[PDB]
Amino acid sequence: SEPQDDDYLYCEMCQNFFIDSCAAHGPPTFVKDSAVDKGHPNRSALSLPPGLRIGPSGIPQAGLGVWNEASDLPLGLHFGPYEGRITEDEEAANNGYSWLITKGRNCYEYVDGKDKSWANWMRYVNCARDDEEQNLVAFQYHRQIFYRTCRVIRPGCELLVWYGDEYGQELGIKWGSKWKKELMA
Ligand SMILES: COc1cc(OC)cc(-c2noc(N3CCN(C)C4(CCN(c5ccnc(C)c5)CC4)C3)n2)c1
Ligand SMILES: C[S@@+](CC[C@H](N)C(=O)[O-])C[C@H]1O[C@@H](n2cnc3c(N)ncnc32)[C@H](O)[C@@H]1O
Ligand SMILES: [Zn+2]
């Protein structure tokens, strides 16, 4: 069939959707987690890619965060997938660590990263408070959540994430409507 709504990627330089590669800026770059057996008690921390550090958040009273150290993270760098336990119970939502996975017309599942032994490092990423400090966008791709860079992130800066059209409720309400197809060029 046609690509599903979550079979599209987004080119942050063109500001439009594409399928395999942007004709001007190429396929995106996916960063792989460090390998760790699922179920391992400090797996989340251990999965962290090289170049990043977990540490106290620059956002006050917000526990831990994830910070860039090695070098400049470029635009259209993709992290993930967000790992965790898969659940249809509503109890998982708003425990702090669950993302919505859209499975149909307003139909959902949760990926619950609370349990450290099942999650990955992305559970430690805090949310942006405003568009200006936001440097990651959470979105659904292949029934999974990824975070992509929407700014160049210099060494020393915290990864801060939020979402929009391509995630959760907005994605579920419009599901099947082929709306990204319209926004290619
Ligand atoms: C998988 O982790 C998740 C998933 C999630 O929602 C699906 C929310 C959170 C989450 N963690 O903390 C918070 N709150 C802190 C206080 N508070 C500031 C907010 C977070 C940021 N919000 C916005 C709104 C508009 N534009 C931007 C840039 C950000 C406002 C509510 C709520 N929310 C974490
Ligand atoms: C996915 S976690 C982020 C990692 C978390 N800081 C930790 O130490 O486990 C989400 C939780 O962190 C806290 N948090 C994340 N972003 C925040 C923000 N912008 N302001 C206040 N608290 C935040 C909230 O308690 C939320 O339930
Ligand atoms: Zn492009």
Side-chain angles (χ1 to χ4, degrees), residues 10 16-17 34 50-51 53 55-56 59-60 82 88 100 104 120 122 125 133 139 141 157 164-165 174 181:
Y10 183 85
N16 39 62
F17 295 91
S34 295
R53 109 192 135 77
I59 298 165
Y82 192 93
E88 300 192 9
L100 233 46
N120 69 336
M122 287 162 72
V125 179
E133 72 180 6
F139 74 110
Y141 183 62
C157 301
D165 295 340
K174 300 214 305 269
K181 184 187 181 162

Side-chain angles (χ1 to χ4, degrees), residues 82 94 96-100 127-131 134 147 162-163 167:
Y82 192 93
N94 293 40
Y97 301 86
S98 304
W99 284 115
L100 233 46
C127 295
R129 294 168 295 188
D130 57 58
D131 300 335
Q134 173 174 14
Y147 296 167
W162 197 242
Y163 59 82
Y167 163 77

Side-chain angles (χ1 to χ4, degrees), residues 49-88 90 92-104 106-153 155-162:
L52 304 182
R53 109 192 135 77
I54 301 168
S57 180
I59 298 165
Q61 284 94 229
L64 297 158
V66 185
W67 295 79
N68 186 39
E69 267 290 296
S71 48
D72 291 335
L73 301 178
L75 268 186
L77 207 65
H78 285 66
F79 297 108
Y82 192 93
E83 268 152 355
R85 281 241 169 289
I86 279 85
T87 285
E88 300 192 9
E90 204 82 334
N94 293 40
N95 71 355
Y97 301 86
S98 304
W99 284 115
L100 233 46
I101 302 287
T102 308
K103 265 169 48 174
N106 200 47
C107 187
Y108 310 95
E109 220 163 32
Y110 302 79
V111 62
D112 177 357
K114 186 158 198 154
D115 186 323
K116 295 173 192 260
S117 50
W118 291 89
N120 69 336
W121 63 274
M122 287 162 72
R123 82 186 294 284
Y124 292 116
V125 179
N126 274 341
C127 295
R129 294 168 295 188
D130 57 58
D131 300 335
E132 270 60 68
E133 72 180 6
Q134 173 174 14
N135 53 20
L136 296 169
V137 186
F139 74 110
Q140 177 169 327
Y141 183 62
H142 295 337
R143 300 286 191 288
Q144 284 178 124
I145 303 295
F146 290 84
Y147 296 167
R148 69 164 179 273
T149 52
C150 77
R151 307 192 181 279
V152 163
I153 309 184
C157 301
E158 194 175 352
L159 277 59
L160 291 178
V161 75
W162 197 242

